[PDB]
Design a protein around this nucleic acid. Structure first.
Length: 47
RNA sequence: CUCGGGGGGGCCGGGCCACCCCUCCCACGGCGCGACCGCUGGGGCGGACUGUCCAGUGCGCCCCGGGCGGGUCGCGCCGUC
């Protein structure tokens, strides 16, 4: 009788982000620097 | 002027270049200033994350400021047989 499809009406939604974005080169570079400082810092404490 | 023959100066008008002042535009090059794009320390807020010391790194919006680069445009000045 009526096979047509009435598309569900789109609604504007609050812009929300549900997953992390890629870490930047600077952040990835700093993290290595922080990790290296932490490793030696621990080694000095042990001694 | 020289022996009718021979050698010369010419005839008055216009505009142009050299002389002296300014003066319009264009092109090229240089110096100085401004507007817009436009390469890239701070401050405020929001957030996401990182580090086996509380410290640190991006991202978003906005407000600055520096180094000082170029591109477009607008000027002022200087140079050009």
């Amino acid at each position: 009788e009526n096979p047509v499809y009435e598309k569900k009406p789109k609604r504007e939604v609050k812009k929300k982000r549900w997953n992390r974005p890629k870490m930047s080169l600077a952040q990835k570079k700093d993290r290595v620097a922080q990790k290296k400082a932490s490793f030696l810092r621990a080694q000095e404490r042990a001694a």
